[PDB]
Structure 1
Amino acid sequence: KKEYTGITYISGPLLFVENAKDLAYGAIVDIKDGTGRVRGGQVIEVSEEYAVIQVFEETTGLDLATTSVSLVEDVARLGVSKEMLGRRFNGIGKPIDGLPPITPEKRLPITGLPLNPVARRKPEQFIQTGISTIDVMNTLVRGQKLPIFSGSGLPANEIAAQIARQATVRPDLSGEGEKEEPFAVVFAAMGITQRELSYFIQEFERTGALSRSVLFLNKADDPTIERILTPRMALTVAEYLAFEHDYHVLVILTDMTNYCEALREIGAAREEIPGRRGYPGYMYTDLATIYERAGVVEGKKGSVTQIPILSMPDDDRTHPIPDLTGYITEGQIQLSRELHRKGIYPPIDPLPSLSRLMNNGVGKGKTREDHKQVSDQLYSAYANGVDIRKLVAIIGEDALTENDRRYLQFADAFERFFINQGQQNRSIEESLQIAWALLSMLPQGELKRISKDHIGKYYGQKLEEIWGAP
C-alpha cells in the first residue's frame, strides 16, 4: 500500500523512520530488505521528527539504503471464532498445526477492556480438576485466580497438562443442574523449549483434549514481543468464548516468570529506568491487566478461570514476581521438592497451599455438605503428623502416645494415597471417600473439626478401597 524508506538509524531492536507521522502508536509494521525478507515490528514512539520501530527477531541484514517499512494494522488485533477449538497458534495467532487459517467471526483488540466492577458477581461454583489436593483442600472456583508456585525442576508442565485433560464442570452436583454447560481450555505456553512443545503436543493429541482446547505456544527462541502478546491473545479468546457463547473457560498460563523477564527485557529496550530488582515499575499494572481478566459476570452464564504457573526464581516467595502475583491473585498451590524427590506425584504440599475463595464454592448444592470440615480436619491431621514425624527422630516411637502414633501412620498414608495419585482422574466423590478412609485411621473423638452427623454418616470406610489399587 504505502512504503516508508526514510530510515535513519538501526541499533539493537530499534529502527528510526523519518516522515512516518501517519503511523499510529502501537501499530504493527512489515519491514522489508533487499533480499525480500519481511520482518515484523511495533511502533513504540511516534513524533514529528521520526517514528521508532521495535523489530521482532533480529536486524542481521538491514541497511538504510534498501530497507522499507509498511503498515499492517493500526492496533494489534486477533481474529477470533469458535473454530479455534482444536487449533494451535504461535502467540501472534499464526497457525502452527498445518491446517488452513480460521475465518474470523470478528476481529477483536487483544488489550481487552477492564470489566466493570458492578457487572461482576461473587464466585460460587467449583470446577473439578481431578487432583485430590486441589478439589478437597484447595478447591478451585469458577472465576478464580489460583496460581501454581513451582520450583526450578519440579513437574509443573505435567500438572498443567493433567489439569487441562481432566478439568470439568459438575452440574449434577448443583441442584437440578442444566442439560449442558460448555467447557473449554485455553493454554498459553510462554518461553517453552522444543522438548516442552513436543510434550504438550503429544499430551493434547493422545487423549482428545485438543478437541476442547486452544493452544497458544510461544517458544524460547521466538521474539519477546510474541511472549508478551501471547497471554493477551489467550485471554481475548477466553473472554470471547465465555461472554459471547456461554462457555466455561479455563486459562492456563504456563510460565509467568518468562513473561516477566520478557517484560523486563522490552522495558530496557524502550530505554526505561528499571524498578525494584530490575523489573519495570509498572509490572504490577501489567500483571493485573493479565490476571484481572478472569471472573464471573452478572447476567452471563459463562466464566473465565485462571491458573497462572510460575517458577519461583530461587525458591524465594519474596521475589517480585511471586510476591506481586500473590498480591493480585486468590491463593497459591505450592509444589514440594521433598515430595517430588520422595516419588510423590503430583507433589502439592497442602500446608503452604491456600485457596481464598474455597469457602464459597463448597457446601450444600456444590460438592457435598461435609467438604469444608473434612478439608480442615485433613489439614490439621497432616500438620500434627509431620510434627510428630520430626519428633520421633529424637524421642522414638515407644515414647509417643497412641494418638501420636496414629497421626504418624495417618501422615504416611496421606502422602502415599491422597497426594500420590499419579495420572489417575478422581471425581470429588472419590477424593472425599479417600479422605474419610484416611480420617478413619484416627479415633472418632480426635476429629474435633467435623460435626457428629457427618462423622456418623461417613466414618468407618476401609483404606483397602484405595490401598488395594493406588
Structure 2
Amino acid sequence: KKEYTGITYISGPLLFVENAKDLAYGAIVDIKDGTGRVRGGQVIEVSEEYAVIQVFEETTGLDLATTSVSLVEDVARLGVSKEMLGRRFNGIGKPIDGLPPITPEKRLPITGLPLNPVARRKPEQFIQTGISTIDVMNTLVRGQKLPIFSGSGLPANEIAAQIARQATVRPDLSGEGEKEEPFAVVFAAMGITQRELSYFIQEFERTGALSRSVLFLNKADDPTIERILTPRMALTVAEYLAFEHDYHVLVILTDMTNYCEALREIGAAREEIPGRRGYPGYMYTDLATIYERAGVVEGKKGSVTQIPILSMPDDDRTHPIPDLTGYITEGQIQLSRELHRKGIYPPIDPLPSLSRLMNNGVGKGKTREDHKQVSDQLYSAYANGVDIRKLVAIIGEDALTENDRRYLQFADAFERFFINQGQQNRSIEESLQIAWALLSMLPQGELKRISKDHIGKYYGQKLEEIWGAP
C-alpha cells in the first residue's frame, strides 16, 4: 500500500531509497517507473537513512524523478499443493506451461529449518535406477546424497533424463511383498539453454513421465537471483511432499557449477572479499544448507534423495566446487571421457566411483543375497584386466599367461556388454544375471571373494543370453 519515492542513487543492479526503514531485511519489493512497467527486487541492506535494493533484470529507463518502490512480502514464500505434480515453473514459482496457477494449500518459506540430528534414522532401502553400473556396483539408497561428476562434452543431461524417466522402487523385493509406495521426482535446472530446455521438455512429455514430476526450469539469460532461489524452492516442495504426504521423492539438480558462479557474481556485486580462487568464503556453508536437506526421519514414511550434478572446470578434482562437495556428500559417480569417445553409453567409470552407504541397502531381504560379493569380484577383476590390456601392446598377446588372457577377454567383454547398455531399462535381477554371465568366463576357483554356495548356485550361465539377445 505504501510507496516510497525517495530514490537517491541508481548504478548497475543497486538502487538506494531514503526514508525506508520500514522495510525488513531480505524483503521482496517491486519497482514501478514512468512507463508502467513493474520490475522485481530484493532488499539487501537496511539502515537508518536508506535501504539498498538489488534489482532483477536490467535498469533501463529508470530515473530519480518518477520511480517508486512498494513492499510485496516480508520474506520469500512459496505456495505449495499436491496439484503441482505435472507442472512447469520458471524458478520463482510462476507457471510457464500455460495452465492456470495452482491454488495454495500452504505458504512456506523457501529457506527451510535444519533437521534435528537425533530425529534421523539409518537409510536401509535401495532405489532401482535401471542402470547396471549404478544399481550393481554403486547402489543408491533412499536418503543418500550421491553426486555425478561430469565434464565439458560428456552427456550428463541424457543420463539425468534417463534416471528421472527410469527410476522406481521395488516393494516386492522387500520383506513379504510390502505395499503401495507413492513416488515422485523433483527436477531443478540452473542456467540451462534453449536446446537443453527443449530436450528436457520433449523427453519428459513423450512417455508420460510428466504425470509424476515437478519441473523448475531456469534459463541462462534469466536473472542470477532466480538461479540462486531455484534449488531452495525445489527442496521446499520435496520436503513438503515427503514429510506431509508420505511420498518417496527424488531430487535432481542439473548443474551446481552454474549455481556457484551465480553465487560468486552476487557476492562480488555486494562488495565482499572472496576466499580461495575468487569464490566466496561461505561457499562450504552455503552448499551445506542445500545438500543436508535430504534424509529419512523416524516416525515418517517418506524420504528425500538427492543426485546433484556438477561439471569439473578442467577435469580437475582439486577445484573448490568438487572438493567441498565431497566433504558433504556420501560418494561419487564419475563419468569417463575415453569411454565416451569409444562409443559407450552411459560412460560411467567403475574405478573412481564409490558409494558410502551401499552396505546398508544391499543384502538379504531387500535384494538378492549375492550382491556385495559379486560387486567386489567384478571390481577386482576389472581392475586386474585394465593393466594387462596395456601390457599386451608391448609384450604381445601370445607371451601372456593363460589367466592374463582370461582377464583381458573379461575386461573387453565387460565394457562391451555390462556398461554399454544404451537406452535399455534393466531390472536388478537382469543386471545380476548379466554379471554372473560375465563371471563364467573366468575359471571357477579364481573367484576368491564369493562364497561356495553362491558359486554352486549361479555359476555356469552362458553369455549368449545377452549376446544373442542384445
How far apart in 2 are the matches of 1:259 and 1:177?
42
How far apart in 2 are the matches of 1:121 and 1:236?
21
1:305: how far off?
A: 0.1
* Structure-2-length-normalised TM-score: 0.99
Spell out, residue by residue over 1:93-151, the C-alpha distance to the aligned partner (whole angstroms, 9 max, x if none).
Answer: 10011111011110110000000000000110001100011000000000000000000
1:159: how far off?
A: 0.2
Spell out, residue by residue over 1:244-279, the C-alpha distance to the aligned partner (whole angstroms, 9 max, x if none).
Answer: 000001000000000000000000011101111111
1:469: how far off?
A: 2.9
1:330 counterpart = 2:321: no
User: What does residue range 218-367 of structure 1 map to in structure 2 within 5 Å?
Assistant: 218-367=218-367
Provide the aligned C-alpha RMSD in A: 0.7
How far apart in 2 are the matches of 1:289 and 1:137?
29
Query: What SS class does the counterpart of residue 461 from structure 1 fall into?
Result: coil
1:465: how far off?
A: 1.1
Spell out, residue by residue over 1:413-438, the C-alpha distance to the aligned partner (whole angstroms, 9 max, x if none).
Answer: 11111110001111100111111111
Which region of structure 1 is more displaced relative to structure 2, 318-327 or 171-180?
Answer: 171-180
Which region of structure 1 is more displaced relative to structure 2, 157-166 or 54-63?
Answer: 54-63
1:179: how far off?
A: 2.2
Which region of structure 1 is more displaced relative to structure 2, 125-134 or 59-68?
Answer: 59-68
Spell out, residue by residue over 1:409-463, the C-alpha distance to the aligned partner (whole angstroms, 9 max, x if none).
Answer: 1111111111100011111001111111111110111111111111111111111
How far apart in 2 are the matches of 1:356 and 1:34?
58
Aligned residue in 2 for 1:19: 19
Identity within the alignment, %: 100
How far apart in 2 are the matches of 1:420 and 1:353?
17
1:467: how far off?
A: 1.4
Runs of 4+ in 1 over 4 A off after TM superposition: none
How far apart in 1 are the matches of 2:88 and 2:196?
14
How far apart in 2 are the matches of 1:3 and 1:128?
55
1:62: how far off?
A: 1.1
How far apart in 1 are the matches of 2:176 and 2:46?
58
Spell out, residue by residue over 1:395-420, the C-alpha distance to the aligned partner (whole angstroms, 9 max, x if none).
Answer: 11111111111111111111111110
1:20: how far off?
A: 1.1
1:177: how far off?
A: 3.4
Spell out, residue by residue over 1:60-112, the C-alpha distance to the aligned partner (whole angstroms, 9 max, x if none).
Answer: 11111111111111111110111110001111010011111011110110000
How far apart in 1 are the matches of 2:296 and 2:237?
16
The 1:393–1:107 alpha-carbon spacing in structure 2 relative to 1, beyond 3 Å, is same
How far apart in 1 are the matches of 2:200 and 2:7?
42
How far apart in 2 are the matches of 1:438 and 1:131?
17
How far apart in 2 are the matches of 1:300 and 1:307?
22
Spell out, residue by residue over 1:303-323, the C-alpha distance to the aligned partner (whole angstroms, 9 max, x if none).
Answer: 000000000000001100000
How far apart in 2 are the matches of 1:466 and 1:48?
74
Which region of structure 1 is more displaced relative to structure 2, 57-66 or 208-217?
Answer: 57-66
Query: What SS class does the counterpart of residue 172 from structure 1 fall into?
Result: helix
Spell out, residue by residue over 1:186-215, the C-alpha distance to the aligned partner (whole angstroms, 9 max, x if none).
Answer: 000000000000000000001111101100
Spell out, residue by residue over 1:332-386, the C-alpha distance to the aligned partner (whole angstroms, 9 max, x if none).
Answer: 1000000001000000000010000011110011121010111111111111111
How far apart in 2 are the matches of 1:119 and 1:463?
48
List runs of 5+ in structure 1 lacking aligned partners: none
How far apart in 1 are the matches of 2:43 and 2:319?
32
Query: What SS class does the counterpart of residue 230 from structure 1 fall into?
Result: helix
How far apart in 2 are the matches of 1:212 and 1:352?
33
1:178: how far off?
A: 2.7
* Structure-1-length-normalised TM-score: 0.99
List runs of 5+ in structure 2 lacking aligned partners: none
How far apart in 2 are the matches of 1:395 and 1:275?
51
Query: What SS class does the counterpart of residue 307 from structure 1 fall into?
Result: strand
